[PDB]
Design an enzyme around this catalytic site. Structure first.
Site, mmCIF file in Angstrom:
data_model
loop_
_atom_site.group_PDB
_atom_site.id
_atom_site.type_symbol
_atom_site.label_atom_id
_atom_site.label_comp_id
_atom_site.label_asym_id
_atom_site.label_seq_id
_atom_site.Cartn_x
_atom_site.Cartn_y
_atom_site.Cartn_z
ATOM 1 N N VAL A 44 0.838 -1.200 0.000
ATOM 2 C CA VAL A 44 0.000 0.000 0.000
ATOM 3 C C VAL A 44 0.875 1.253 0.000
ATOM 4 C CG1 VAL A 44 -1.706 1.373 1.282
ATOM 5 C CG2 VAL A 44 -1.927 -1.126 1.178
ATOM 6 N N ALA A 45 2.010 1.156 0.688
ATOM 7 C CA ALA A 45 2.964 2.251 0.817
ATOM 8 C C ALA A 45 3.783 2.505 -0.455
ATOM 9 C CB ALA A 45 3.909 1.972 2.012
ATOM 10 N N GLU A 105 -1.792 5.240 -4.928
ATOM 11 C CA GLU A 105 -3.204 4.992 -5.173
ATOM 12 C C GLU A 105 -4.055 6.200 -5.574
ATOM 13 O OE1 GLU A 105 -2.077 4.004 -1.927
ATOM 14 O OE2 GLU A 105 -1.272 2.105 -2.679
ATOM 15 N N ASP A 117 -3.037 20.434 -44.032
ATOM 16 C CA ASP A 117 -3.637 20.592 -45.344
ATOM 17 C C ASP A 117 -3.663 22.113 -45.462
ATOM 18 O OD1 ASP A 117 -4.381 17.887 -46.097
ATOM 19 O OD2 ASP A 117 -5.899 17.965 -44.489
ATOM 20 N N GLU A 171 -15.075 28.913 -58.587
ATOM 21 C CA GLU A 171 -16.038 29.298 -59.607
ATOM 22 C C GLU A 171 -16.998 30.317 -59.037
ATOM 23 O OE1 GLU A 171 -17.897 25.752 -60.965
ATOM 24 O OE2 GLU A 171 -16.648 25.599 -62.775
ATOM 25 N N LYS A 222 -12.046 27.654 -70.025
ATOM 26 C CA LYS A 222 -11.296 28.196 -68.883
ATOM 27 C C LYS A 222 -10.493 27.045 -68.239
ATOM 28 C CE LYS A 222 -14.230 27.352 -64.921
ATOM 29 N NZ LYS A 222 -15.403 27.732 -64.081
ATOM 30 N N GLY A 257 -2.669 21.315 -52.892
ATOM 31 C CA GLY A 257 -3.014 20.890 -54.236
ATOM 32 C C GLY A 257 -2.339 21.778 -55.262
ATOM 33 N N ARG A 314 0.533 18.676 -54.884
ATOM 34 C CA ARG A 314 -0.049 17.639 -55.732
ATOM 35 C C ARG A 314 0.209 16.283 -55.114
ATOM 36 N NH1 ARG A 314 -1.063 19.782 -60.906
ATOM 37 N NH2 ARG A 314 -1.518 22.014 -60.561
ATOM 38 N N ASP A 323 -9.635 14.770 -43.321
ATOM 39 C CA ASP A 323 -11.075 14.986 -43.094
ATOM 40 C C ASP A 323 -11.986 14.024 -43.840
ATOM 41 O OD1 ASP A 323 -10.436 15.989 -45.610
ATOM 42 O OD2 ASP A 323 -11.961 17.577 -45.510
ATOM 43 N N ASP A 348 -8.457 9.926 -45.706
ATOM 44 C CA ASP A 348 -7.388 10.415 -44.829
ATOM 45 C C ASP A 348 -7.277 9.596 -43.548
ATOM 46 O OD1 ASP A 348 -6.546 12.558 -46.456
ATOM 47 O OD2 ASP A 348 -8.031 13.925 -45.562
ATOM 48 N N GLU A 360 4.287 16.032 4.226
ATOM 49 C CA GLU A 360 3.721 16.040 2.890
ATOM 50 C C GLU A 360 3.272 17.419 2.476
ATOM 51 O OE1 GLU A 360 4.097 13.992 0.418
ATOM 52 O OE2 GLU A 360 5.320 13.059 1.978
HETATM 53 MG MG LIG Z 1 -9.541 15.239 -48.135
#
Ligand SMILES: [Mg+2]
Ligand SMILES: C/C=C(/C)C(=O)O[C@@H]1C[C@H]2C(=C1C)[C@@H]1OC(=O)[C@@](C)(O)[C@@]1(O)[C@@H](OC(=O)CCCCCCCCCCC)C[C@]2(C)OC(C)=O
Ligand SMILES: [K+]
Length: 994
Positions: A304-305, A309, A351, A442, A515, A626, A678, A703, A707, A908
């Site tokens: 115990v000593a 605990e 990211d 966009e 585009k 990216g 990339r 996310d 991943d 103590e």
């Molecule tokens: Mg992702």
């Protein structure tokens, strides 16, 4: 059958030998099922109370206690008939301890959640197949679909398996592969095969991924793979194969148990030797039954000593508090043991888009061609204002406002921006803000259009709910969008085939508006629109164009550019096959350049500083983006990953470059790299392994379900609050605001927490050291137990817990984020600090034993046997004439124990003050620095009296209040401790390389 995507519709029907018209037969079904098994991910980890509860008693410390609780229980029920019925309060309390901690372990884990279990939320219950056993479609259970059989899916349906599409029944098939690939916008599928056998999911345009959703349409297809062989199943397998190490502290706990285990028994050996004379004593008499009971009661006390605990309770209550504290700062920490690992992170892979930047696009510069003549050339750059998707801003040439109409080159740039665009805007009353409808890059273009309304069309005479898509709908009714050639990474662009509305204009009609990324688009241009006229694209003009793009994407602007063009005489509508993205680049050729637009994804305010903190903290920050290479670097300099002029040649890699390297340099790249452009899911896991091969504690962001393998493999998986639940359940922490700075704020708290946590641990551990020395003396001398397990428990749990938890709120060093990351292998106690506790322990062990031996010998209240071996107390009744002319129960007196117990209790509280700082003296760092500490000490002391006065307590704690003169004896014995340590601290600070 993998690779189904590079195969033809026919080859896939051939391979499995099935008819698109009939569907597998029952003999084919049951046969395929015994070869491919069922379409479902494996079950759960089988753990039961029996199994679960066991572990709760596997820990060496717990084992040691369970044992002691027994010896205790035996003795407890093996003495006097009623000399003290309270003989049972000893084993009972121990049991309650173990029992209580077990009830904790269990409830704890039961409320946990498996990331792999979270995957099953993507498994539909039913599916639709065409089998021979019926001409009509059957809606069976997904679990029963097999590789080869013909499947049918439509809007709203959740894909049941990895399917190769055979024929699209609707006019268009749109899928929401957000979770897998990522792209949140529904993507378009086709039927033609994808050449490359090693294509990434994002490019398997002819596949349906089990777990994804059909945003729009209806199709028929053949099942390529099932269950664990599907893209998502492959992910489940990686996560199952992932094995997480134990937090450095959890390792230290096991190591500490392995030792405490050894020392204890060694003490027994020693103790047994110390009293080896017993082997040279009478061959009869004595009491082999009483001496035994003694050595056993010492065993239980020793145990115990030796164990802290109260630690479990103190540690968790500390972490629970931090947890709540971090949530207030947008860092949701699931898994308390993680707060620690968090604090030691040395590398952070983030990211970019949603967490380093705001992900709120806006165009800053435009530029059309003003004049070409011979080798002379002149552009017409512009600048635009407004960072919000809000239609409020102005266009400017050399900061000077302008009316876009005065330029025809801009009339078209705008039209292209409004027609070749799947996204839009919308105003809401809820928050009175303008919100992005489709995609970010966009939705920004539609916004640009509003800010330069080429026609000057009236609008301030319009509300905000209509101001949204005003100047855009005008251009929309000026042309009639026939069809659109969706974006594909092969050609890096998209276009739209429009046809003039009515005859009013009917100007040559059928125009194609493209585009895309500049390099690609500009190469396919043979002409250049100068206002309203056209001229042949020439080397000179080409260079001048590419240059401005490089200055905008590499320069301090770090703008992502979009080249805008039109195909004046597109091919004849009938000559185009609008359903094989392979021919789209062919249709988008012989173009005429009309202009480029450079937009910006703004870094967050708090990010700049946060990056700096990591530098000061020795934490490496790796960006995962990216954006193409060159531009990625720009972004790194802008935020501080790289210095404006700092070299980066070897510190930045593209997914390609990296793969092109051999395991050798792939691993080398990772220790010095700081920018990955990339990238790809495969990489995040590879990059972690390497970072780990350098024993680096790395945190990784993610996310999507794609991943999760990496999030679970990193030391700390960081999931986005706006992210999927699978990502979340596989990460140790979630960013409520998806902000990178939130991460750094969390790593800091972590370092804080550990620092206090490291103190109170040392504190409690040290006290155990002393408690043990006491017990070792009491028995190495043969004298009366000065301290009882019941008391020790109360102290290790209650009186010492309070101060320990208080130490949890110790003021945090001001230099926390200026020192490097803590080494995980750093021991909580070694070197000089060891010796100190070694000594301090030696001190309290003496103070306590001596304290009780004092009330025996030299006491004014109790019969002081002077300096006569009071140890032989074991022989009093039998030898009441040889040195014992008095009672014999004086050896079981309460006073001597409350004497030693009170010296402990006070030593103590003194130690709880020596623990406010490892080396700083109390004069320099006064107790009042931590109010909680002092306040807790009062609750402890008074609680101490609680058990000295209140009836039940003392009676059962074998304690009786001591007078005001004995108490002073306590103070004289205990108080010195503060001095003993002050000296040892002095030695550390001064005469010592510290
Ligand atoms: Mg992702
Ligand atoms: C305990 C009682 C007696 C009679 C005894 O004998 O303890 C001994 C003495 C020694 C150790 C013992 C086993 C430990 O063994 C180890 O392997 C070390 C290297 O941990 C250790 O050497 C040190 O403890 C430490 O560092 C801190 C260990 C912290 C363990 C718990 C960590 C937190 C667990 C959190 C779980 C979520 C020093 C220590 C105690 O001596 C001194 C003077 O402190
Ligand atoms: K992890």
């Amino acid at each position: 059958m993998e690779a189904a995507h590079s195969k033809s519709t026919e080859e896939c029907l051939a391979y499995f030998g099935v008819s698109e018209t009939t569907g597998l037969t029952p003999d084919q079904v049951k046969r395929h099922l015994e070869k491919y098994g069922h379409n479902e991910l494996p079950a759960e980890e089988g753990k039961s109370l029996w199994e679960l509860v066991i572990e709760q008693f596997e820990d060496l410390l717990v084992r040691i206690l369970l044992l002691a609780a027994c010896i205790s229980f035996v003795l407890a029920w093996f003495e006097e008939g009623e000399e003290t019925i309270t003989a049972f309060v000893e084993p009972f309390v121990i049991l309650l301890i173990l029992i209580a901690n077990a009830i904790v372990g269990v409830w704890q884990e039961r409320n946990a959640e498996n990331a792999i279990e979270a995957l099953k939320e993507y498994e539909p219950e039913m599916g639709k197949v065409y089998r021979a056993d019926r001409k009509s479609v059957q809606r069976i259970k997904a679990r029963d679909i097999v590789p080869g059989d013909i499947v049918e899916v439509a809007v709203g349906d959740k894909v049941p398996a990895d399917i190769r599409i055979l024929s699209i029944k609707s006019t268009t098939l749109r899928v929401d592969q957000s979770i897998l690939t990522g792209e949140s916008v529904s993507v378009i599928k086709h039927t033609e095969p994808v050449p490359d056998p090693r294509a990434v999911n994002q490019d398997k345009k002819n596949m349906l991924f089990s777990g994804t959703n059909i945003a729009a349409g209806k199709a028929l297809g053949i099942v390529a793979t099932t269950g664990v062989s599907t893209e998502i199943g492959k992910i489940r397998d990686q996560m199952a194969a992932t094995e997480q190490d134990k937090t450095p502290l959890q390792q230290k706990l096991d190591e500490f148990g392995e030792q405490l285990s050894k020392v204890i028994s060694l003490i027994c050996v020693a103790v047994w030797l110390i009293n080896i004379g017993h082997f040279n004593d009478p061959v009869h008499g004595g009491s082999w039954i009483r001496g035994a009971i003694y050595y056993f009661k010492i065993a239980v006390a020793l145990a115990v000593a030796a164990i802290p605990e109260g630690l479990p309770a103190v540690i968790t209550t500390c972490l629970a508090l931090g947890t709540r504290r971090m949530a207030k700062k947008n860092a949701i920490v699931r898994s308390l043991p993680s707060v620690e690992t968090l604090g030691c992170t040395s590398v952070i892979c983030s990211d970019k888009t949603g967490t380093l930047t705001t992900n709120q696009m806006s165009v800053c510069k435009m530029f059309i061609i003003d004049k070409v003549d011979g080798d002379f050339c002149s552009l017409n750059e512009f600048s635009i204002t407004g960072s919000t998707y809000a239609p409020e801003g102005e266009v400017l040439k050399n900061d000077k406002p302008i009316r876009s109409g005065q330029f025809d080159g801009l009339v078209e740039l705008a039209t292209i921006c409004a027609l070749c665009n799947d996204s839009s805007l919308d105003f809401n009353e809820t928050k009175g803000v303008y919100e992005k409808v489709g995609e970010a890059t966009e939705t920004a273009l539609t916004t640009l259009v509003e800010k330069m309304n080429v026609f000057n069309t009236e609008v301030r005479n319009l509300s905000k709910v209509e101001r949204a898509n005003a100047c855009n709908s005008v251009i929309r009714q000026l042309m009639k969008k026939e069809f659109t050639l969706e974006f594909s990474r092969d050609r890096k662009s998209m276009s739209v085939y429009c046809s003039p509305a009515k005859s009013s204009r009917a100007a040559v009609g059928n125009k194609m508006f493209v585009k895309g990324a500049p390099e690609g688009v500009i190469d396919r241009c043979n002409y250049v629109r100068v206002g309203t006229t056209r001229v042949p694209m020439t080397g000179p003009v080409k260079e001048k164009i590419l240059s401005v793009i490089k200055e905008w994407g590499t320069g301090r602007d770090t703008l992502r550019c979009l080249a805008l063009a039109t195909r004046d005489t597109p091919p004849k509508r009938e000559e185009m096959v609008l359903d094989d993205s392979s021919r789209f680049m062919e249709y988008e050729t012989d173009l005429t350049f009309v202009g480029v637009v450079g937009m910006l994804d703004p870094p967050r305010k708090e990010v700049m500083g946060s990056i700096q903190l990591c530098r000061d903290a020795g934490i490496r920050v790796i960006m995962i983006t990216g954006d193409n290479k060159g531009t990625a670097i720009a972004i790194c300099r802008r935020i501080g990953i790289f210095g404006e002029n700092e070299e980066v040649a070897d510190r930045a890699y593209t997914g390609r470059e990296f793969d092109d390297l051999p395991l050798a340099e792939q691993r080398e790249a990772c220790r010095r790299a700081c920018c990955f452009a990339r990238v790809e899911p495969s990489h995040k896991s590879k990059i972690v392994e390497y970072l780990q091969s350098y024993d680096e504690i790395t945190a990784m962001t993610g996310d999507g379900v794609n991943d999760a393998p990496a999030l679970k493999k990193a030391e700390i998986g960081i999931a986005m609050g706006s992210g999927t639940a699978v990502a979340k359940t596989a990460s140790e922490m979630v960013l409520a605001d998806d902000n990178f700075s939130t991460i750094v704020a969390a790593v800091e708290e972590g370092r804080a927490i550990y620092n206090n946590m490291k103190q109170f641990i040392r504190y409690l551990i040290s006290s155990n050291v002393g408690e043990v020395v006491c017990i070792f003396l009491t028995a190495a001398l043969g004298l009366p137990e000065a301290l009882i397990p019941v008391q020790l428990l109360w102290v290790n749990l209650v009186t010492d817990g309070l101060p320990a938890t208080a130490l949890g709120f110790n003021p945090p060093d001001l230099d926390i984020m200026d020192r490097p990351p803590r080494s995980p292998k750093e021991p909580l106690i070694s070197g000089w600090l060891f010796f100190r506790y070694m000594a301090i322990g030696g001190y309290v062990g003496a103070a306590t034993v001596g304290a009780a031996a004092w009330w025996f010998m030299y006491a004014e209240d109790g019969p002081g046997v002077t300096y006569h071996q009071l140890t032989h107390f074991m022989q009093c009744t039998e030898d009441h004439p040889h040195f014992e002319g008095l009672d014999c129960e004086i050896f079981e007196a309460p006073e001597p124990m409350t004497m030693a117990l009170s010296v402990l209790v006070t030593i103590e509280m003194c130690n709880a003050l020596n623990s406010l700082s490892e080396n700083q003296s109390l004069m320099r760092m006064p107790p009042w620095v931590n109010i909680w500490l002092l306040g807790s000490i009062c609750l402890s002391m008074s609680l101490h009296f609680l058990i000295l006065y209140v009836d039940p307590l003392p009676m059962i704690f074998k304690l009786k209040a001591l007078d005001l003169t004995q108490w002073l004896m306590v103070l004289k014995i205990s108080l010195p401790v503060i001095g003993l340590d002050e000296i040892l601290k002095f030695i550390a600070r001064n005469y010592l390389e510290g």
